[PDB]
C-alpha cells in the first residue's frame, strides 16, 4: 500500500522480551521444493529458501542488524579481530563450547576446510560462490585448535560476509573432500551447530522439521520446533488462512488483500536486498550469443510496465530496479539502465541492421526464426512477467517461447546448465553487495549461468575489490554495473517489497529486511499480550 520498495534501516518483527513469550510452540512455514542438495555452498544447493532454513542451524560469525551493521556473534566466536589491515589478516577465535551435532568441536580446521573448498584451487568442488576465498593466501592455526588466522593476498573489504549473512560455517566433514561436498548432502544436511537441528526429513509428507539442538550451548529457544511444508505458490495464502502455516510472503496486491482481510494475520514490511530479473544466455550456440542481438532484444522489454503491473497496490510509486549491484535505498544506488532503455523502434532498427528482418511471422536470419526460450518457475506472478515481455517482444518481431517449469531441479537441471535463452529468477542479497561481482558477473563466475562476460568487466571488478575506500569502491562498482548493462547480461525487474503475512501471535519474527533473526527469541505471545514497547 504506502511504503516504497527500498531497503531501509528497520525490521518489522513485533519485538518482545522472549522471556515473556510462551515456552514452546511450532513455527510452521512453507518451502517451494525439497532441495536437490542440502550443501548450501554447492552449485545445486544455493537455494535461498534452504539457506534461510539453515540459518537456524549453522554458525554465522556476525549478526547483521536492520541497518546492515555487524556485531560478532559471541555464541560462535569469542572474538573476531582485524589483526592487520593491509595485508589483511583476520583472526577468528572460536567459542570453546561450540560443538557440531555429532559431538565434534568446532575448530580452526572447519574454517580452513571451508575456505579451501570454495577457493577455486581444486576444480572438483562444484561451488556456487567463492565469497572471496580465492583471495586468502593462507588459513593457519592460531594459539590453539580453536583459533584460525586468515591471511589475505589481496584486499577484500567484505571479509565479514564469508561466514555471515547469506554465508555460514559448515563442518570440515562436509567440506574437506570433493566427494563429501558434492554428494554428501544429497539426502539431507550434515552435522550442524545452532539453536535448532534438522531432525526429520519426510519426503512422503513433504515436511522438514527443526527441533531444539540438545547440544546447543546458548540461550534455550522459546520454540519447540520450526516445521517447513512443501507448498506451491498458489497454496501459500490459503494455507495461512486455513491455519496450516504461520507466515508466508506477500508478493502481489491480491495476496496482500487476502492476507489483510484474514483475522489473526498481521502485515509486516521491511524490504531486503533481493530482486527478480531476466538473465540472458550468451553461451556459444545460443541465439543470444550475439551481444548486439542481446542489446536490441533488451530494448524491446518494457521493464517499467512490468514493475508497475507486478507491484501496483503493493508498494508506492512502483519502479523497476535499475542496478545489478545496489538496490533502491542502498548507498551507491543509481540508474545505469539507459544503454537498454525501452525503445521498440530503435530495437527494430537494430534488428534490421543485424539481418533479423521481417521475413515471416517473426523476424528471420539465415533460415532461423528469432525465437527466445524464456525459462521461468511456473506461478501466477512469474507467468505474468513472461506474458508482458512476450507481448512487447512480439510487437518487434521477436517470439518469446514461454518454457514454464517446476520442481526441485529448476536450477540444477535447467538454469545451472544453460537450458534457456532468457531465464527469470531472483537473487537474494545480504549486507555484502560486492561479493556478488566475482560470483555472478566475472567471466569465470561460478553463478555466471549465461556465460556472458568480458575482460573489461573482469578488470573493473578487480579495481572494485582492490579499493579500500568505501565511496570510491561504490563508484567503481557502479562502473562495473554500467558495463554489465552494456553487455546485455541481465535485466533487473523488481526488487522485493519486503511484505510478509505473519500470524499475529508471533513475536521476534516478521519482515527482517537487512537483519538476521535471533532464532532463540522467536516465540508465540501469551493471551492478552497486547503491549508493544518497540
Amino acid at each position: 500500500a504506502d511504503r516504497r520498495a527500498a531497503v531501509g534501516t528497520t525490521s518489522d518483527i513485533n519485538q518482545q522480551d522472549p522471556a515473556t513469550l510462551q515456552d514452546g510452540g511450532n513455527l510452521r512455514l512453507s518451502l517451494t521444493d525439497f532441495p536437490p542438495n542440502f550443501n548450501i555452498l554447492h552449485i545445486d544447493g544455493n537455494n535461498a529458501e534452504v539457506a534461510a532454513m539453515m540459518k537456524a542451524t549453522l554458525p554465522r560469525a556476525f549478526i547483521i542488524g536492520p541497518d546492515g551493521s555487524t556485531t560478532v556473534d559471541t555464541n560462535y566466536f569469542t572474538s573476531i579481530e582485524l589483526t592487520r589491515t593491509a595485508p589483511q589478516v583476520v583472526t577468528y577465535t572460536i567459542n570453546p563450547e561450540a560443538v557440531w551435532s555429532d559431538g565434534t568441536p568446532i575448530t580452526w580446521r572447519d574454517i580452513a576446510s571451508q575456505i579451501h573448498a570454495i577457493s577455486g584451487a581444486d576444480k572438483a568442488f562444484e561451488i556456487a560462490s567463492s565469497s572471496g576465498a580465492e583471495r586468502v593466501a593462507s588459513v593457519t592455526r592460531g594459539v590453539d585448535d580453536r583459533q584460525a588466522v586468515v591471511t589475505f593476498a589481496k584486499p577484500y573489504a567484505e571479509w565479514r560476509g564469508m561466514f555471515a549473512g547469506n554465508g555460514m560455517l559448515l563442518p570440515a566433514s562436509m567440506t574437506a573432500t570433493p566427494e563429501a561436498f558434492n554428494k554428501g548432502q544429497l539426502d539431507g544436511p550434515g552435522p550442524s551447530a545452532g539453536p535448532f537441528v534438522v531432525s526429520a526429513l519426510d519426503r512422503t509428507a513433504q515436511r522438514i522439521v527443526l527441533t531444539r539442538n540438545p547440544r546447543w550451548w546458548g540461550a534455550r529457544p522459546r520454540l519447540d520446533s520450526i516445521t517447513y511444508l512443501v507448498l506451491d505458490d498458489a497454496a501459500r495464502l490459503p494455507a495461512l488462512q486455513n491455519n496450516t502455516i504461520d507466515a508466508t510472503g506477500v508478493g502481489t496486491l491480491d495476496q496482500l488483500t487476502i492476507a489483510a482481510r484474514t483475522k489473526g494475520i498481521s502485515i509486516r514490511r521491511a524490504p531486503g536486498p533481493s530482486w527478480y530479473h531476466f538473465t540472458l544466455n550468451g553461451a556459444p550456440g545460443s541465439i543470444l550469443a550475439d551481444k548486439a542481438l542481446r542489446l536490441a532484444i533488451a530494448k524491446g522489454i518494457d521493464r517499467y510496465t512490468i514493475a508497475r503491473v507486478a507491484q501496483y497496490g503493493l508498494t508506492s510509486d512502483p519502479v523497476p530496479l535499475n542496478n545489478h549491484v545496489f538496490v533502491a535505498g542502498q548507498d551507491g544506488y543509481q540508474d545505469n539502465s539507459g544503454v537498454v532503455a525501452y525503445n521498440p523502434e530503435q530495437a527494430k532498427r537494430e534488428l534490421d541492421a543485424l539481418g533479423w528482418r521481417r521475413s515471416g511471422a517473426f523476424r528471420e536470419k539465415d533460415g532461423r526464426q528469432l525465437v527466445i526460450r524464456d525459462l521461468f518457475y511456473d506461478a501466477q506472478s512469474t507467468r505474468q512477467f513472461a506474458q508482458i515481455a512476450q507481448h512487447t517482444l512480439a510487437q518487434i518481431g521477436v517470439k518469446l517461447e514461454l518454457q514454464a517449469k517446476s520442481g526441485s531441479g529448476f536450477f540444477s537441471d535447467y538454469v545451472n546448465v544453460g537450458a534457456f535463452d532468457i531465464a527469470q529468477f531472483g537473487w537474494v542479497g545480504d549486507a555484502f553487495p560486492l561479493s556478488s561481482l566475482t560470483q555472478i558477473y566475472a567471466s569465470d563466475g561460478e553463478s555466471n549461468f549465461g556465460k556472458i562476460g568480458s575482460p573489461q568487466i573482469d578488470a573493473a571488478i578487480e579495481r572494485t575489490l582492490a579499493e579500500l575506500d568505501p565511496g570510491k569502491a561504490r563508484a567503481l562498482a557502479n562502473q562495473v554495473d554500467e558495463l554489465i548493462w552494456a553487455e546485455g547480461f541481465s535485466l533487473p525487474l523488481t526488487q522485493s517489497p519486503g511484505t510478509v503475512a505473519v500470524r499475529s501471535t508471533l513475536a521476534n519474527f516478521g519482515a527482517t529486511g537487512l537483519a538476521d533473526l535471533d532464532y532463540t527469541a522467536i516465540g508465540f505471545m501469551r493471551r492478552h499480550h497486547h503491549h508493544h514497547h518497540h
Binding site: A48, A128, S274, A310, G426, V428
Partner: peptide
Amino acid sequence: ASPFSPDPP
C-alpha cells in the same frame, strides 16, 4: 546476491 530463488522475492 549469493543465493537464488525461483519466485520474485
